[PDB]
mmCIF file of C-alpha atoms in Angstrom:
data_model
loop_
_atom_site.group_PDB
_atom_site.id
_atom_site.type_symbol
_atom_site.label_atom_id
_atom_site.label_comp_id
_atom_site.label_asym_id
_atom_site.label_seq_id
_atom_site.Cartn_x
_atom_site.Cartn_y
_atom_site.Cartn_z
ATOM 1 C CA UNK A 1 0.000 0.000 0.000
ATOM 2 C CA UNK A 2 1.493 3.357 -1.171
ATOM 3 C CA UNK A 3 0.433 6.831 0.126
ATOM 4 C CA UNK A 4 1.203 10.355 -1.234
ATOM 5 C CA UNK A 5 3.034 12.463 1.371
ATOM 6 C CA UNK A 6 5.094 15.664 1.371
ATOM 7 C CA UNK A 7 8.364 16.360 3.198
ATOM 8 C CA UNK A 8 9.934 19.677 4.223
ATOM 9 C CA UNK A 9 13.695 20.252 4.466
ATOM 10 C CA UNK A 10 15.498 22.409 7.046
ATOM 11 C CA UNK A 11 16.707 25.757 5.742
ATOM 12 C CA UNK A 12 13.837 26.375 3.346
ATOM 13 C CA UNK A 13 10.058 25.974 3.295
ATOM 14 C CA UNK A 14 8.508 24.189 0.326
ATOM 15 C CA UNK A 15 6.304 21.125 -0.171
ATOM 16 C CA UNK A 16 7.785 18.509 -2.534
ATOM 17 C CA UNK A 17 6.367 15.055 -3.750
ATOM 18 C CA UNK A 18 7.631 11.924 -1.871
ATOM 19 C CA UNK A 19 6.867 8.134 -1.877
ATOM 20 C CA UNK A 20 6.184 6.205 1.395
ATOM 21 C CA UNK A 21 6.253 2.363 1.548
ATOM 22 C CA UNK A 22 4.522 0.691 4.552
ATOM 23 C CA UNK A 23 4.738 -3.073 5.393
ATOM 24 C CA UNK A 24 3.543 -5.405 8.238
ATOM 25 C CA UNK A 25 7.074 -5.395 9.875
ATOM 26 C CA UNK A 26 8.624 -1.891 9.268
ATOM 27 C CA UNK A 27 8.050 1.595 7.710
ATOM 28 C CA UNK A 28 10.420 3.117 5.058
ATOM 29 C CA UNK A 29 10.699 6.261 2.845
ATOM 30 C CA UNK A 30 11.508 5.994 -0.924
ATOM 31 C CA UNK A 31 12.810 8.875 -3.144
ATOM 32 C CA UNK A 32 10.645 9.706 -6.241
ATOM 33 C CA UNK A 33 13.722 10.686 -8.400
ATOM 34 C CA UNK A 34 16.357 7.989 -7.492
ATOM 35 C CA UNK A 35 13.782 5.230 -6.516
ATOM 36 C CA UNK A 36 15.877 4.148 -3.446
ATOM 37 C CA UNK A 37 15.406 3.910 0.377
ATOM 38 C CA UNK A 38 16.978 6.731 2.503
ATOM 39 C CA UNK A 39 15.907 5.901 6.125
ATOM 40 C CA UNK A 40 13.567 3.349 7.832
ATOM 41 C CA UNK A 41 11.906 2.772 11.266
ATOM 42 C CA UNK A 42 10.586 -0.369 13.072
ATOM 43 C CA UNK A 43 6.809 -0.925 13.645
ATOM 44 C CA UNK A 44 7.259 -1.872 17.380
ATOM 45 C CA UNK A 45 9.413 1.285 18.129
ATOM 46 C CA UNK A 46 6.431 3.703 17.476
ATOM 47 C CA UNK A 47 4.916 5.170 20.668
ATOM 48 C CA UNK A 48 2.308 7.782 19.721
ATOM 49 C CA UNK A 49 0.953 9.535 16.628
ATOM 50 C CA UNK A 50 -1.161 12.597 15.835
ATOM 51 C CA UNK A 51 -3.865 12.281 13.183
ATOM 52 C CA UNK A 52 -4.457 15.729 11.690
ATOM 53 C CA UNK A 53 -6.513 16.577 8.537
ATOM 54 C CA UNK A 54 -3.355 17.751 6.746
ATOM 55 C CA UNK A 55 -0.348 16.927 8.949
ATOM 56 C CA UNK A 56 0.759 13.714 10.686
ATOM 57 C CA UNK A 57 3.148 13.788 13.650
ATOM 58 C CA UNK A 58 5.048 10.534 14.222
ATOM 59 C CA UNK A 59 6.749 9.848 17.554
ATOM 60 C CA UNK A 60 9.491 7.211 17.916
ATOM 61 C CA UNK A 61 11.003 5.727 21.118
ATOM 62 C CA UNK A 62 14.696 4.649 21.065
ATOM 63 C CA UNK A 63 15.419 4.960 17.288
ATOM 64 C CA UNK A 64 14.984 8.522 15.958
ATOM 65 C CA UNK A 65 16.578 11.520 17.685
ATOM 66 C CA UNK A 66 14.906 14.157 15.524
ATOM 67 C CA UNK A 67 11.283 14.564 14.459
ATOM 68 C CA UNK A 68 9.278 13.169 11.538
ATOM 69 C CA UNK A 69 6.150 15.023 10.408
ATOM 70 C CA UNK A 70 4.796 14.762 6.853
ATOM 71 C CA UNK A 71 1.673 15.962 5.037
ATOM 72 C CA UNK A 72 -0.909 13.213 4.421
ATOM 73 C CA UNK A 73 -4.295 13.344 2.587
ATOM 74 C CA UNK A 74 -5.671 10.210 4.404
ATOM 75 C CA UNK A 75 -4.419 10.575 8.028
ATOM 76 C CA UNK A 76 -7.390 8.628 9.537
ATOM 77 C CA UNK A 77 -6.710 5.565 7.262
ATOM 78 C CA UNK A 78 -2.947 5.404 8.188
ATOM 79 C CA UNK A 79 -3.669 5.660 11.993
ATOM 80 C CA UNK A 80 -6.238 2.768 11.843
ATOM 81 C CA UNK A 81 -3.796 0.558 9.791
ATOM 82 C CA UNK A 82 -0.926 0.859 12.384
ATOM 83 C CA UNK A 83 -3.293 0.138 15.368
ATOM 84 C CA UNK A 84 -4.620 -3.073 13.705
ATOM 85 C CA UNK A 85 -1.088 -4.472 12.985
ATOM 86 C CA UNK A 86 -0.126 -4.101 16.719
ATOM 87 C CA UNK A 87 -3.350 -5.991 17.767
ATOM 88 C CA UNK A 88 -2.407 -9.040 15.551
ATOM 89 C CA UNK A 89 1.160 -9.279 17.076
ATOM 90 C CA UNK A 90 -0.163 -9.179 20.725
ATOM 91 C CA UNK A 91 -2.566 -12.134 20.013
ATOM 92 C CA UNK B 1 17.245 46.282 4.992
ATOM 93 C CA UNK B 2 18.340 47.215 1.490
ATOM 94 C CA UNK B 3 16.174 48.149 -1.493
ATOM 95 C CA UNK B 4 17.569 46.413 -4.586
ATOM 96 C CA UNK B 5 14.289 46.910 -6.415
ATOM 97 C CA UNK B 6 12.676 50.364 -6.539
ATOM 98 C CA UNK B 7 9.986 50.819 -3.889
ATOM 99 C CA UNK B 8 9.092 51.322 -0.221
ATOM 100 C CA UNK B 9 8.468 48.028 1.519
ATOM 101 C CA UNK B 10 11.616 46.368 0.180
ATOM 102 C CA UNK B 11 13.260 47.724 3.330
ATOM 103 C CA UNK B 12 10.461 46.701 5.710
ATOM 104 C CA UNK B 13 10.245 43.175 4.333
ATOM 105 C CA UNK B 14 13.969 42.467 4.646
ATOM 106 C CA UNK B 15 14.145 43.959 8.135
ATOM 107 C CA UNK B 16 11.187 41.813 9.168
ATOM 108 C CA UNK B 17 12.767 38.814 7.435
ATOM 109 C CA UNK B 18 15.690 39.160 9.850
ATOM 110 C CA UNK B 19 13.317 39.067 12.815
ATOM 111 C CA UNK B 20 11.094 36.345 11.427
ATOM 112 C CA UNK B 21 14.162 34.272 10.547
ATOM 113 C CA UNK B 22 15.209 34.547 14.172
ATOM 114 C CA UNK B 23 11.862 33.181 15.412
ATOM 115 C CA UNK B 24 12.013 30.407 12.815
ATOM 116 C CA UNK B 25 15.309 29.215 14.245
ATOM 117 C CA UNK B 26 13.892 29.419 17.773
ATOM 118 C CA UNK B 27 10.821 27.354 16.798
ATOM 119 C CA UNK B 28 13.059 24.996 14.805
ATOM 120 C CA UNK B 29 15.188 24.150 17.831
ATOM 121 C CA UNK B 30 12.133 24.240 20.094
ATOM 122 C CA UNK B 31 10.740 21.277 18.167
ATOM 123 C CA UNK B 32 13.452 19.084 19.668
ATOM 124 C CA UNK B 33 13.756 21.196 22.821
ATOM 125 C CA UNK B 34 10.186 20.667 24.062
ATOM 126 C CA UNK B 35 10.382 16.893 23.549
ATOM 127 C CA UNK B 36 13.612 16.557 25.537
ATOM 128 C CA UNK B 37 12.157 18.395 28.565
ATOM 129 C CA UNK B 38 14.595 21.259 27.942
ATOM 130 C CA UNK B 39 11.858 23.880 27.678
ATOM 131 C CA UNK B 40 10.322 25.992 30.464
ATOM 132 C CA UNK B 41 6.486 26.008 30.825
ATOM 133 C CA UNK B 42 5.248 28.921 28.641
ATOM 134 C CA UNK B 43 6.444 32.515 29.024
ATOM 135 C CA UNK B 44 3.578 34.047 30.986
ATOM 136 C CA UNK B 45 0.124 32.676 30.211
ATOM 137 C CA UNK B 46 -2.391 29.972 31.203
ATOM 138 C CA UNK B 47 -3.594 26.967 29.179
ATOM 139 C CA UNK B 48 -6.974 28.172 27.898
ATOM 140 C CA UNK B 49 -5.520 31.638 27.411
ATOM 141 C CA UNK B 50 -3.140 30.047 24.902
ATOM 142 C CA UNK B 51 -6.166 29.033 22.846
ATOM 143 C CA UNK B 52 -7.349 32.624 23.283
ATOM 144 C CA UNK B 53 -4.075 34.388 22.401
ATOM 145 C CA UNK B 54 -3.108 32.154 19.498
ATOM 146 C CA UNK B 55 -6.541 31.908 17.858
ATOM 147 C CA UNK B 56 -7.171 35.657 18.155
ATOM 148 C CA UNK B 57 -3.826 36.363 16.476
ATOM 149 C CA UNK B 58 -4.278 33.763 13.717
ATOM 150 C CA UNK B 59 -7.664 35.177 12.699
ATOM 151 C CA UNK B 60 -6.283 38.708 12.431
ATOM 152 C CA UNK B 61 -3.295 37.348 10.537
ATOM 153 C CA UNK B 62 -5.529 35.694 7.932
ATOM 154 C CA UNK B 63 -7.550 38.907 7.964
ATOM 155 C CA UNK B 64 -4.493 40.830 6.760
ATOM 156 C CA UNK B 65 -3.062 38.029 4.577
ATOM 157 C CA UNK B 66 -5.566 38.670 1.784
ATOM 158 C CA UNK B 67 -5.020 42.505 1.687
ATOM 159 C CA UNK B 68 -1.278 41.828 1.906
ATOM 160 C CA UNK B 69 -1.409 39.530 -1.123
ATOM 161 C CA UNK B 70 -3.137 42.335 -3.014
ATOM 162 C CA UNK B 71 -0.559 44.767 -1.659
ATOM 163 C CA UNK B 72 2.523 42.682 -2.365
ATOM 164 C CA UNK B 73 1.698 42.520 -6.063
ATOM 165 C CA UNK B 74 0.778 46.203 -6.453
ATOM 166 C CA UNK B 75 0.060 48.263 -3.305
ATOM 167 C CA UNK B 76 3.649 49.254 -2.524
ATOM 168 C CA UNK B 77 2.861 51.979 0.005
ATOM 169 C CA UNK B 78 0.200 49.791 1.593
ATOM 170 C CA UNK B 79 2.210 46.582 1.593
ATOM 171 C CA UNK B 80 4.526 47.851 4.305
ATOM 172 C CA UNK B 81 1.481 48.471 6.488
ATOM 173 C CA UNK B 82 0.305 44.887 5.980
ATOM 174 C CA UNK B 83 3.775 43.526 6.737
ATOM 175 C CA UNK B 84 3.911 45.464 10.014
ATOM 176 C CA UNK B 85 0.666 43.785 11.046
ATOM 177 C CA UNK B 86 1.548 40.262 9.933
ATOM 178 C CA UNK B 87 4.941 40.142 11.626
ATOM 179 C CA UNK B 88 3.712 41.441 14.970
ATOM 180 C CA UNK B 89 1.014 38.763 15.399
ATOM 181 C CA UNK B 90 3.515 35.985 14.746
ATOM 182 C CA UNK B 91 5.623 37.003 17.741
ATOM 183 C CA UNK B 92 2.981 36.087 20.423
ATOM 184 C CA UNK B 93 2.095 33.058 18.305
ATOM 185 C CA UNK B 94 5.663 31.861 18.642
ATOM 186 C CA UNK B 95 5.687 32.629 22.390
ATOM 187 C CA UNK B 96 2.253 31.083 22.885
ATOM 188 C CA UNK B 97 3.144 28.001 20.826
ATOM 189 C CA UNK B 98 6.389 27.489 22.734
ATOM 190 C CA UNK B 99 4.288 27.946 25.841
ATOM 191 C CA UNK B 100 1.804 25.272 24.794
ATOM 192 C CA UNK B 101 4.759 23.078 23.832
ATOM 193 C CA UNK B 102 6.253 22.871 27.277
ATOM 194 C CA UNK B 103 3.014 23.438 29.179
ATOM 195 C CA UNK B 104 0.602 21.069 27.434
ATOM 196 C CA UNK B 105 1.140 17.327 27.907
ATOM 197 C CA UNK B 106 -2.357 15.825 27.833
ATOM 198 C CA UNK B 107 -2.836 14.772 24.205
ATOM 199 C CA UNK B 108 -0.401 14.065 21.285
ATOM 200 C CA UNK B 109 -1.663 17.326 19.750
ATOM 201 C CA UNK B 110 1.060 19.043 21.804
ATOM 202 C CA UNK B 111 3.708 18.413 19.139
ATOM 203 C CA UNK B 112 1.154 18.653 16.331
ATOM 204 C CA UNK B 113 0.192 22.289 16.945
ATOM 205 C CA UNK B 114 3.868 23.099 17.515
ATOM 206 C CA UNK B 115 4.602 22.017 13.938
ATOM 207 C CA UNK B 116 1.464 23.677 12.549
ATOM 208 C CA UNK B 117 2.836 26.969 13.906
ATOM 209 C CA UNK B 118 6.440 26.189 12.921
ATOM 210 C CA UNK B 119 5.587 25.600 9.256
ATOM 211 C CA UNK B 120 3.127 28.498 9.512
ATOM 212 C CA UNK B 121 5.904 30.960 10.309
ATOM 213 C CA UNK B 122 7.923 29.301 7.541
ATOM 214 C CA UNK B 123 5.121 30.041 5.080
ATOM 215 C CA UNK B 124 5.202 33.632 6.335
ATOM 216 C CA UNK B 125 8.942 33.733 5.654
ATOM 217 C CA UNK B 126 8.462 32.637 2.041
ATOM 218 C CA UNK B 127 5.648 35.185 1.963
ATOM 219 C CA UNK B 128 7.894 38.166 2.796
ATOM 220 C CA UNK B 129 10.344 36.665 0.280
ATOM 221 C CA UNK B 130 8.076 36.930 -2.753
ATOM 222 C CA UNK B 131 6.618 40.212 -1.505
ATOM 223 C CA UNK B 132 10.139 41.650 -1.354
ATOM 224 C CA UNK B 133 10.645 40.837 -5.026
ATOM 225 C CA UNK B 134 7.251 41.806 -6.410
ATOM 226 C CA UNK B 135 6.583 44.606 -3.938
ATOM 227 C CA UNK B 136 4.900 47.345 -5.920
ATOM 228 C CA UNK B 137 6.633 46.170 -9.073
ATOM 229 C CA UNK B 138 5.010 43.473 -11.256
ATOM 230 C CA UNK B 139 7.744 43.957 -13.883
ATOM 231 C CA UNK B 140 10.924 42.597 -12.255
ATOM 232 C CA UNK B 141 8.727 39.972 -10.648
ATOM 233 C CA UNK B 142 7.090 38.258 -13.627
ATOM 234 C CA UNK B 143 7.556 34.772 -12.174
ATOM 235 C CA UNK B 144 7.326 36.177 -8.665
ATOM 236 C CA UNK B 145 3.696 36.916 -9.544
ATOM 237 C CA UNK B 146 3.142 33.146 -9.576
ATOM 238 C CA UNK B 147 5.428 32.516 -6.578
ATOM 239 C CA UNK B 148 3.391 34.940 -4.454
ATOM 240 C CA UNK B 149 0.332 32.783 -5.129
ATOM 241 C CA UNK B 150 2.260 29.765 -3.857
ATOM 242 C CA UNK B 151 3.228 31.553 -0.640
ATOM 243 C CA UNK B 152 -0.292 32.791 0.146
ATOM 244 C CA UNK B 153 -1.867 29.363 -0.436
ATOM 245 C CA UNK B 154 0.875 27.795 1.688
ATOM 246 C CA UNK B 155 0.001 30.069 4.618
ATOM 247 C CA UNK B 156 -3.753 29.384 4.639
ATOM 248 C CA UNK B 157 -2.947 25.665 4.465
ATOM 249 C CA UNK B 158 -1.396 25.792 7.941
ATOM 250 C CA UNK B 159 -3.903 28.380 9.214
ATOM 251 C CA UNK B 160 -6.988 26.185 8.747
ATOM 252 C CA UNK B 161 -5.058 23.188 10.078
ATOM 253 C CA UNK B 162 -4.020 25.065 13.234
ATOM 254 C CA UNK B 163 -7.558 26.235 14.053
ATOM 255 C CA UNK B 164 -8.643 22.577 14.088
ATOM 256 C CA UNK B 165 -6.299 21.904 17.016
ATOM 257 C CA UNK B 166 -7.150 25.166 18.800
ATOM 258 C CA UNK B 167 -10.883 24.536 18.989
ATOM 259 C CA UNK B 168 -10.467 20.954 20.133
ATOM 260 C CA UNK B 169 -7.755 22.109 22.558
ATOM 261 C CA UNK B 170 -10.588 23.520 24.666
ATOM 262 C CA UNK B 171 -11.055 19.984 25.986
ATOM 263 C CA UNK B 172 -8.023 18.479 24.221
ATOM 264 C CA UNK B 173 -5.584 20.698 26.111
ATOM 265 C CA UNK B 174 -7.735 22.141 28.869
#
């Protein structure tokens, strides 16, 4: 399942197209121009998340030092997908 | 504060850019400061008053954003007046947002509104950028005419998104 998100870079302020690949074990970001993976995070390391109409704040435990917040069109669908995957692992 | 173009406002925009840039850096480092418990609880305001202060400012910002857009492309002598207004409201917004950052800890919206204000001031930075170019002069700003439309639509994008958190923050932060 692929979702259209936008990422902002430090120094400037502009929204640019980006590809995000989500799986049942881990989350990873793919570049639209080079078609390669830059950085990835584990599914069990996520603590909390904010589901906003335009933005989406992702909070990580002992993995990411900085912050990761991208612009999503379907924030309610992504939040429900992550919650369901955690329920299957606990059972 | 130099005028490389040919109008009043070029000065005001660049001088404000210096100030706004300073609050961008503060909010940029406050994003990682508030999460590491390295931030002091607000500056001098309560929790519901944050919703008051911030929302009241945001509305009046948007209020002036439209007349500023009109001014930036043509109203040179008026543009400076709009800029004065826009920049001043963002100061308490920064303070209030940094306040809410360290002070609020009930819902995950704490770091959400902090980013909605961070990218909001960033959109205001790009705003004074295009306005500096086009200010009162559509000629040496042919493409800037289109860039100004990208800066105004970028601002309202974070404005409507911030208000969503403010109104819920009544019970979501209170």
